[PDB]
Symmetry: D2
Subunit: 249 residues, 4 copies
């Protein structure tokens, strides 16, 4: 009852998994939210519960925008209170990412890219605050939102909307002692299936070490922002990009 | 011979001033409106009295829905039907009201605030580009996006998403010769519902003249960005705020 | 009658295009120069042939030193002595060269880069404001200030300082009806041209000058503390 | 062997807090000071009583002059003379006073405000890099540089120049494995000269707790940036402002 509890969206794999593991290692009980990756979510929960019993549960939800998304987001937050009796930390990590050229239906693309990257964060933030000591929300942003990838307008719109949520929610929730911050990766984990020749093109752009961030390096910034060492920090977005965003064309 | 412009939410206030000033510059205009049919028709009558066959109205709800892409395609189609071309799109229409995080359905609020401020601009941008010189798009942004109104999360999210669209569409549409820029008012025409005491509180905050922007002052920056004097400007957002965004708390 | 403008570094390139376009708009102009006397006088001769006694030149070193305040007071005073008024100040003069962090003295580089790009604009702003119907200052900024050229630390510091001055001066001078804004060129090598999204159009000094003309016009009377990027979209392009 | 840090302006207030927290983390420290000799020596004595031979003082004026490069080289050299290495540089020393545009010589004000806030950090960064594992530089910026205090032009110019240095130095020193970041306080320790009524005016503006940052809160963000938990972070500026910069006029 004395261990704090965290919800991490899109926690089965990659960066969300690293966040969930590092929160667990810091002493949090975790809700591992997932959409399609059930086997991976359950494997992570079983690993964490082997390390300390009754410290991890999974929660499935589609975070695409729809008439039912508010209820789904309320139920993710409720899953943390039902398992652990509290919810101290929300990490909005789940995200759709694919091109939408201006030149799936376009409204499905809107629902997926704006829903996962912005509306679901907003509704999870409402539900988190309504249900409420070091409370905080961390949003996974994008260091490159001002130099965006060609043909990613909806993704980019969603990530800019998430900056606006981070700022608006930081201002409105400060009186409740809820801090709201972001972590903005540059290039972190690349797709397994991406050719090494294409991965290397991206790695060579990064000033600091000519490599992508590990998931753990992203998670380290999340751990800092939820810690007692960040008690005066709200409305801040920490770039974890190895200097990538400083590199001109 | 005369270029043509679409102005969304053009029946009243800033959109009306933009439509008038484009018309005075030589443009044929589509006056888009949602509810303000009498004002839209009155404006078209006034512009047509000055030069015949230079203004038409087009009704559309720009709330997000599965038919919003068709409504946006229809607005651009209405410009081609009336005038045989579409040179300028001004994304001005916008919903604005509070959406507190702590306590219309929330999904209707998402649809209205994110639809009008961000998704409709995106879909109008797609339709504008697909249907294609001095081609340009001007998005009406908000100079106060980083110092937002308490309890305006969804509005602020939509205006941040509009910044993202302005940048992403500038990058992607540059090869087609379409420039995409923004105009960011601070306090301009104050809400019709606001009491006089509250209006004077906001006026006194503005360094340059202790007054709100006129609609015509906002329209002047739109006129610059669509002109031949801006043909190397794309992805830029011009604040028209009298210095308000420079004022600390 | 006619308003008057000071343009620093006005003998060549962007300053010259700004001076010509202000003159064409109906301003009388002070053409400031440091080393380019022949070019400054050639420009003044071209403008005075169009309208008599509407252009003068003014020599000043804008390197920071013990005398830079007096030099900046003289540039503003030159406008008031020639024309009886000073409505517009365009801070265009700039030094540009690399200053690597790892291996002219470095303090000479500070005096040139920080002096010309930031301190002279500050002192000219003070002198302009102290001597005071559509009054404004336009600072020539840099669209790539947040994605800087490798080994250009002092240049980049000076251009960031000039953003700070634009904002601080906009705030402090708004009560005097003086607007303060910036224009931020991108590129004004074929390598650089190929990266520009609007690169089908040639970058020109006239395009920068067009943004300056907008900002000093009545069409910008509510605009202060704004920096207009004129970069063809270059600052949007990722590495 | 213990790493070593230089902290400028470290005799009192935030610089002392940074020196203390670096010492508690296991660094040997150079306590730079200008006028505060008694406070600097009293701090070095306290740190040396905790662990012998872990703190020294170094006096220097960081006003700009033709000698400033030699002074900055000497500060870095004092860390190597004492400790055999120099792992961290914290640029904290800063002059802060108004310089009204409309009415010390102005050139003295330039030398002090631009010297301490920008040129000395630049020259110390050059000396730090030239003299060269987890190497990093942390610059103390200002969260309110875009909403500045009235009549502080030179101070604001100096802090904007420091942001430029942070980004330029991050790009250029990344290949040498030197990270360069910033910490941007909003309101922390209020000026000693300020009356309680004026201090309370500022405190009431801060969303998160209606109070200024403690010196330790600022030092916490510095400790994070120099730590292994920030190995991929360079060119980032962490606001530590309690949401103050999000508050509109
Ligand atoms: N990787 C990078 O280089 C990078 C760069 C910049 C920003 N970021 C940001 O960092 C965060 C993590 O990145 P990442 O690469 O680890 O993410 P990712 O692998 O692309 O996606 C994370 C998870 O999001 C969940 N998700 C996707 N669509 C969803 C939906 N409709 N409903 C619910 N959940 C859904 C998925 O869960 P299931 O697998 O369970 O279906 C997926 O595993 C994201 O916010 C991303 O934008 C990453
Ligand atoms: N006024 C300011 O101080 C200020 C400040 C910052 C930014 N801005 C921006 O500048 C632009 C103009 O501002 P304004 O105050 O003139 O705007 P406004 O009066 O609030 O709204 C403009 C028009 O938007 C239309 N609109 C609202 N909901 C809509 C929907 N669901 N579908 C279609 N149209 C809809 C309305 O058309 P009908 O009347 O026909 O229904 C309305 O007349 C907006 O983008 C605004 O965000 C304004
Ligand atoms: N060119 C670009 O692509 C570009 C890009 C970004 C920003 N900008 C900005 O746009 C503005 C104009 O650019 P530009 O390329 O036309 O500038 P420029 O040719 O490099 O220099 C303009 C003038 O500055 C004056 N100047 C230089 N050092 C001086 C000193 N110590 N004292 C007095 N005057 C001095 C010179 O006048 P004299 O010849 O009389 O000695 C010079 O002709 C600058 O502020 C620049 O930073 C330009
Ligand atoms: N306090 C805040 O609320 C706040 C807000 C925003 C940003 N910051 C930034 O955070 C840092 C620490 O702030 P603070 O309030 O603790 O600073 P501070 O007390 O105003 O100044 C720190 C030290 O700077 C040194 N300094 C001043 N002029 C100098 C010179 N000419 N040569 C060498 N050193 C000089 C002084 O050393 P001596 O005492 O030995 O003479 C002084 O103790 C500063 O960079 C500041 O700009 C602070
Ligand atoms: N959800 C999600 N997944 C990703 N793989 C990226 C992403 N968001 N943003 C990215 C930006 C750059 C990149 O290389 C990858 C990503
Ligand atoms: N559609 C729309 N209408 C408004 N009246 C404002 C708006 N957007 N943004 C505003 C920001 C400030 C303000 O005083 C008013 C507004
Ligand atoms: N005074 C001055 N002169 C220049 N040529 C540039 C400059 N400032 N900034 C530049 C940025 C890019 C570039 O290609 C050129 C410049
Ligand atoms: N060197 C220095 N000392 C200070 N006391 C402040 C400062 N810089 N910046 C500040 C910004 C706000 C404030 O209340 C105080 C300060």
């Amino acid at each position: 009852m004395e261990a704090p509890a965290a919800v991490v969206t899109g926690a089965a794999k990659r960066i969300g998994r690293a966040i969930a593991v590092k929160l667990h290692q810091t002493g949090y009980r975790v809700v591992i939210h997932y959409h399609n990756s059930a086997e991976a979510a359950v494997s992570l929960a079983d690993e964490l519960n082997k390390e300390r019993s009754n410290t991890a549960v999974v929660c499935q939800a589609d975070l695409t925008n729809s008439n039912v998304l508010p209820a789904s987001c309320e139920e993710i937050i409720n899953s943390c209170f039902r398992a652990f009796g509290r919810c101290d930390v929300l990490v909005n990590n789940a995200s759709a990412f694919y091109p939408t050229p201006l030149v799936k239906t376009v409204e499905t693309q809107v629902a997926e890219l704006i829903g996962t990257n912005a509306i679901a964060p907003f509704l999870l933030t409402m539900s988190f605050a309504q249900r409420q000591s070091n409370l905080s929300i961390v949003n996974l942003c994008d260091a490159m939102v001002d130099q965006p990838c060609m043909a990613f307008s909806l993704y980019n719109m969603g990530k800019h909307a998430l900056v606006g949520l981070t700022q608006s929610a930081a201002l409105e929730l400060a009186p409740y002692g809820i801090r709201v911050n972001g972590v903005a990766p540059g290039v972190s984990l690349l797709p397994v299936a991406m050719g090494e020749e294409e991965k290397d093109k991206w790695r060579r752009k990064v000033p600091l070490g000519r490599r992508e961030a590990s998931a753990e390096q992203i998670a380290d910034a999340v751990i800092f922002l939820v810690s007692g060492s960040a008690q005066y920090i709200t409305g801040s977005i920490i770039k974890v990009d190895g200097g990538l965003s400083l590199v001109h064309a």
